[PDB]
């Protein structure tokens, strides 16, 4: 790190509280989509949200001041500013931004973009020098005064300048799944002080595989030597010329409207107000997700059965009980060595996100001609006398080429199959019957002849035999301990979360409960089939499932075409304030004027009118509903 200088004054300037308008929209995915509405839960700036009216540097006799603060990163940062002086040069991201942690660096000059991620030691007020090159009459960077040490770089990127060429440039910085996603957009404006109203779907610039924890940031500025004079004076530089404006992304739900060009034109937050949330319900609140599966288990022994050196005959199909293990089906589904892959009830994909009580493994060897009849509901000697699949089979059936396995010089006649059985095998039945079959009225007593025949015949699968005659291995997976990957995350109580238990998913609040599920019950439900509570594995504790703060959301809408003003109906609550306004955000829970308690429930804001009118849009309890350019309510008339 460079030698650091003390420029910040003890005098502090207070922050401000102003609106974000409708800025900060960026593309959630790179998949080309057009004229489609996409819902997503990710990090964003809500509309009308708190953005601070910061001043990076401010000159307040000739008295001048300098106060460049430090802000944490949390989940994500949105930045934009109105400046064409290029004094704003870059940013730093990371956790502490000292030499203790790996940190990323982006470099931009008149030539190109340079990126490096070494162990940098950043000063409290990092800066770069700039000077006027009078013979060529150009402002040029002089020296680097940010870091004197750079070790262990793991990424480098070179491209044309993006922040170079009243000038509003708007940038988005993310670091997700090891990729540092940078979204960029530039806009000339006709404003000075505030962030202008209106929408701007901000363009995705580039994704960069950095992969480092980031919890704090600070904007990078290039300070002129004028203030670097030994006094507190900046003779040739406006020590107040730089101001920044930063908002914090929050995990929120958004819907994106696409045009026929594939370009995003408008978006609506479900967390703006119930008036906005109305359009979310009609297509015209959670903050986090928690995932917990049965854990503390090893891997499942698929290789012990799939990759077995010796494979049993078809009439001797086996049972392996599979339990207390984690199963990875991607290596099985995506193996390039399985010609037959049919699953019933469950999809071939997303098996790694599913859990099962018990799984049975079926394995044998049959020829290519015998591959086709391996399916539920088939008929034949294998199907009727050797192996009968249940009609209601839940699982997968797998067959593939296994050609080069069971040949020998001199004839290999190991495997056999059944020709005679009086009755079909039941679903999941075993019969080891090998009695000498009687084909007549004379009891055979193990002696063959006319009407007395041996029920078993040796295959003798031969390599020189035809392709269909050649042995191909087949596997059936019976689904009744076993789960897909994901180490269970710790639990969080009293917070609105998206929960995923042992294959069951849902959203709500996890809290302690008194309902005692039976020692082998994992989930319990009340009336209307609502998952009321779940019992936590590895601790056998019971957690209640409470919806986040209530009331059914029914749309009372005149229509978007005429006006965007409607009313909210609370069916069976007293005038208890949405559980004492737990959120209290979003314009103070959407203004929390007139309170009109009805037999149909409690109503906020809408005036009650003494006289009655013909019913237009009912709310309940005899009251229907615009007039005086405002939302109105009145008792319905009977004629």
């Amino acid at each position, epitope marked *: 790190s460079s030698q650091c200088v003390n420029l910040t004054t003890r005098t502090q300037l207070p922050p401000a509280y102003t609106n974000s308008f409708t800025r900060g929209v960026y593309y959630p995915d790179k998949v080309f989509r057009s004229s489609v509405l996409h819902s997503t839960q990710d990090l964003f700036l809500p509309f009308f949200s708190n953005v601070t009216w910061f001043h990076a540097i401010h000159v307040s006799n000739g008295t001048k001041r300098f106060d460049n603060p430090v802000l944490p990163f949390n989940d994500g940062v949105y930045f934009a500013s109105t400046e064409k002086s290029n004094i704003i040069r870059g940013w730093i991201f990371g956790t502490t931004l000292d030499s203790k942690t790996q940190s990323l660096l982006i470099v931009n000059n008149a030539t190109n973009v340079v990126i490096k991620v070494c162990e940098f030691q950043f000063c409290n007020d990092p800066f770069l020098g700039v000077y006027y090159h009078k013979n060529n009459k150009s402002w040029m960077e002089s020296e680097f005064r940010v870091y004197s040490s750079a070790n262990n770089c793991t990424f480098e990127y070179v491209s044309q300048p993006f922040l170079m060429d009243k000038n509003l440039r708007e940038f988005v910085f993310k670091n997700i799944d090891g990729y540092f996603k940078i979204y960029s957009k530039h806009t000339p404006i006709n404003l000075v002080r505030d962030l202008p109203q209106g929408f701007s779907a901000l363009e995705p610039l580039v994704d960069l595989p950095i992969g480092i924890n980031i919890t704090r940031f600070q904007t990078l500025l290039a300070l002129h030597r004028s203030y670097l004079t030994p006094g507190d004076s900046s003779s040739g530089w406006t020590a107040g010329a730089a101001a920044y404006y930063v908002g914090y992304l929050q995990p929120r739900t958004f819907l994106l409207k696409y045009n026929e060009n594939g370009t995003i034109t408008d978006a609506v937050d479900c967390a703006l107000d119930p008036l906005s949330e109305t359009k979310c319900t009609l297509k015209s609140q959670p903050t986090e997700s928690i995932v917990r599966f049965p854990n503390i288990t090893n891997l499942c022994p698929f290789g012990e059965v799939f990759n077995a050196t010796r494979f049993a005959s078809v009439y001797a199909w086996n049972r392996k009980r599979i339990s207390n293990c984690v199963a990875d089906y991607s290596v099985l589904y995506n193996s390039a060595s399985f010609s037959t892959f049919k699953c019933y009830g469950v999809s071939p994909t997303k098996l790694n996100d599913l859990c099962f009580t018990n799984v049975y493994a079926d394995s044998f060897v049959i020829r290519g001609d015998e591959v086709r009849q391996i399916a539920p509901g088939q008929t034949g000697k294998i199907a009727d006398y050797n192996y009968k699949l249940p009609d209601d089979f839940t699982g997968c059936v797998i067959a593939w080429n296994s050609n080069n396995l069971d040949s020998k010089v001199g004839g290999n006649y190991n495997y056999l199959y059944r020709l005679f059985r009086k009755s079909n095998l039941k679903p999941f039945e075993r019969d080891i019957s090998t009695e000498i079959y009687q084909a007549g009225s004379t009891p055979c007593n193990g002696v063959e002849g006319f009407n007395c025949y041996f029920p078993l015949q040796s295959y003798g699968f031969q390599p020189t035999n035809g392709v269909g005659y050649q042995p191909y291995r087949v596997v059936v997976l019976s689904f009744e301990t076993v789960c897909g990957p994901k180490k269970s995350t710790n639990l969080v109580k009293n917070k609105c979360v998206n929960f995923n238990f042992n294959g069951l998913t849902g959203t709500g609040v996890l809290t302690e409960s008194n309902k*005692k599920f*039976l*020692p*082998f*019950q994992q989930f319990g439900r*009340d009336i209307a089939d609502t998952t009321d509570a779940v019992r936590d594995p590895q601790t056998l504790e019971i957690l209640d499932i409470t919806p986040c703060s209530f009331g059914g959301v029914s749309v009372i809408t005149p229509g978007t075409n005429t006006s965007n003003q409607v009313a909210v109906l609370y069916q069976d609550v007293n005038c208890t304030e949405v559980p004492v306004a737990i959120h209290a955000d979003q314009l103070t829970p959407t203004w929390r004027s007139n309170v009109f308690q009805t037999r149909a429930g409690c109503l906020i804001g809408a005036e009650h009118v003494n006289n009655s009118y013909e019913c237009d849009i009912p709310i309940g309890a005899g009251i229907c509903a615009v007039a005086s350019q405002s939302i109105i309510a009145y008792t319905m008339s009977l004629g």
Partner: antibody, heavy 121, light 108 residues
Framework: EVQLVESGGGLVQPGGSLRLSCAASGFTFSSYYMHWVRQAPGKGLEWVSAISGSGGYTYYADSVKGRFTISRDNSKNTLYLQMNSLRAEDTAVYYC??????????????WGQGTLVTVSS | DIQMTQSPSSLSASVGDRVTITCQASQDISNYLNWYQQKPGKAPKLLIYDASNLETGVPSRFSGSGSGTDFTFTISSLQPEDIATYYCQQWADWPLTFGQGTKVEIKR
């Protein structure tokens, strides 16, 4: 003394309706799990329904699913068994059945005496 | 559902003998099993719970054990008041089924 007297039993036509009463005394009927069990004339027992947490919750059998409804009450601490669309196999002596599963004991509570129910023409 | 095909349907022995009545099971209920005693025309009563633990006020001659798919239970010494038919219950979650019954009687 804990005593589960039953009332409401009697003769009902097929498809009829009836509410059975099991007054509870000697204990907090509003804090102990309480059940219903039926036992066919001359045959074994069969589980019917239960209140998971006295004062709330629900629990039915598939053999009584939709056809039959369980309910309790607060204050006077009485138990009810609402039968709808009764059948011939529904004929049995019925016991307003007990329960203590919520606590460490995994069994039931008292066994009141239980009273006959018959469905015939 | 859980099925228990108790055998024998009915057995008899003399006073003081040891009696074994078989409760089977369906799927590894471990030790979540309770026992019931029911006299003719009388309300059923517990005999052993947790597959090994006698309730208070229960004769020590009544005892049971087992896990998985076979549950033994013994009447160490038949008594004139031991006359009854005994039921083995399924205390597995999803509580659907009782025992089909084992009737015990006296040689005389």
């Amino acid at each position: 003394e804990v005593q589960l007297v039953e009332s409401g039993g009697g003769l009902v036509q097929p498809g009829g309706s009836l509410r059975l009463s099991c007054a509870a005394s000697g204990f907090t009927f509003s804090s102990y799990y309480m059940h219903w069990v039926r036992q066919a004339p001359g045959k074994g027992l069969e589980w019917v329904s239960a209140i998971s947490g006295s004062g709330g919750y629900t629990y039915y059998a598939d053999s009584v699913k939709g056809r039959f409804t369980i309910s309790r009450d607060n204050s006077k601490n009485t138990l009810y068994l609402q039968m709808n669309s009764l059948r011939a196999e529904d004929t049995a002596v019925y016991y307003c059945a007990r329960d203590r599963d919520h606590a460490y004991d995994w069994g039931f509570d008292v066994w009141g005496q239980g009273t006959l129910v018959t469905v015939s023409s | 559902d859980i099925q228990m095909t108790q055998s024998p349907s009915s057995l008899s022995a003399s006073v003081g003998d040891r009696v074994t009545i078989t409760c089977q099971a369906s799927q590894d209920i471990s030790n979540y099993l309770n026992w019931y005693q029911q006299k003719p025309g009388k309300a059923p009563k517990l005999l052993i719970y947790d597959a090994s633990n006698l309730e208070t006020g229960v004769p020590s001659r009544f005892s049971g054990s087992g896990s998985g798919t076979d549950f033994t239970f013994t009447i160490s010494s038949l008594q004139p008041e031991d006359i009854a038919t005994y039921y083995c219950q399924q205390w597995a979650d999803w509580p659907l089924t009782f025992g089909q019954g084992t009737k015990v009687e006296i040689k005389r």
